[PDB]
């Protein structure tokens, strides 16, 4: 379930989470249309755009 951010994303509307390009994250799930992903990082938990992340083996 390990992923990496494709781009920086600045938290905006409710319950989103800032992530930084190249940072790893874990994915808990997705929103109703799959366009938002609920992720966990060392900074917290929140929604990030699903097209801003990709899997990484380790």
Domains parsed from the chain with CATH numbers = 1-58 (2.30.30.40)
User: Which tokens is 28 given?
Assistant: 């808990």
* Cα 50 to Cα 34: distance, rounded to the nearest angstrom: 7
Give the whole-angstrom CA distance, residue 31 versus residue 51: 13
Helix (H, G, I), strand (E, B) or coil at 44: strand
Phi and psi at residue 52, in whole multiples of 5°? -100, 0
Say how far apart CA 41 and CA 45 lie, in whole Å. 6
Task: Report the C-alpha gap between 54 and 9 in whole angstroms.
Answer: 14
Residue 51's SS3 state is: helix
Report the alpha-carbon distance of residue 58 to residue 48 in Å, rounded. Answer: 20
Resolution rounded to one decimal, in angstroms: 1.6
Q: How far is CA 7 from the centre of its chain?
A: 10
Q: Are 57 and 7 spatial neighbours (Cβ–Cβ below 8 Å)?
A: no
- Tokens encoding 10: 């600045």
């Amino acid at each position: 379930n390990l992923f990496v951010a494709l781009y920086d994303f600045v938290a905006s509307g409710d319950n989103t989470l800032s992530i930084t390009k190249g940072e790893k994250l874990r994915v808990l799930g997705y929103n109703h249309n799959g366009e938002w992903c609920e992720a966990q990082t060392k900074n917290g938990q929140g929604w990030v755009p699903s097209n801003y992340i990709t899997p990484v083996n380790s």
